[PDB]
Design a protein around this nucleic acid. Structure first.
Ligand SMILES: [K+]
Ligand SMILES: [Mg+2]
Ligand SMILES: [Mg+2]
Ligand SMILES: [Mg+2]
Ligand SMILES: [Mg+2]
Ligand SMILES: [Mg+2]
Ligand SMILES: [Mg+2]
Ligand SMILES: [Mg+2]
Ligand SMILES: [Mg+2]
Ligand SMILES: [Mg+2]
Ligand SMILES: [Mg+2]
Ligand SMILES: [Os+3]
Ligand SMILES: [Os+3]
Length: 74
RNA sequence: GCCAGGAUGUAGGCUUAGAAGCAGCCAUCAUUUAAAGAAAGCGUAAUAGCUCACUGGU
């Protein structure tokens, strides 16, 4: 009955990586490198607000947002 | 030609008083798809709104 909207993937990724802001040049200057176990946790929490058909698809999106801000997943 | 869609993470990150597809900078991934650009124009203070690409019907 009441919408609990979760934080933007970006702010979730910022928190996970432990930083205050993304790269001004995503491709050239990476400012953080997290592991998938985390990208996975984000895709699980952000799941209600996602239109994915599975977690791996959810992570695809989450990782896509990590690419736009300069964060690296391993 | 006309009708209908043109979506979701997301107001991408940065910067900026604001900067939400559309001041400027760096990128331009992914999801759900029949299709739909991190958007080709108009538009807003920033939003909104309208149109285009793209798809279906006729
Ligand atoms: K803008
Ligand atoms: Mg003609
Ligand atoms: Mg979008
Ligand atoms: Mg912003
Ligand atoms: Mg904001
Ligand atoms: Mg400055
Ligand atoms: Mg809008
Ligand atoms: Mg922008
Ligand atoms: Mg639009
Ligand atoms: Mg503008
Ligand atoms: Mg039309
Ligand atoms: Os319309
Ligand atoms: Os596509």
């Amino acid at each position: 009955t009441f919408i609990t909207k979760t934080p933007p993937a970006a702010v979730l990724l910022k928190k996970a990586a432990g930083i205050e802001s993304g790269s001004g040049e995503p491709n050239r200057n990476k400012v953080a490198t997290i592991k998938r176990d985390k990208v996975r946790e984000i895709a699980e929490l952000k799941m209600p607000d996602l239109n994915a058909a599975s977690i791996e698809a959810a992570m695809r999106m989450i990782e896509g947002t990590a690419r736009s801000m300069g964060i690296v997943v391993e």
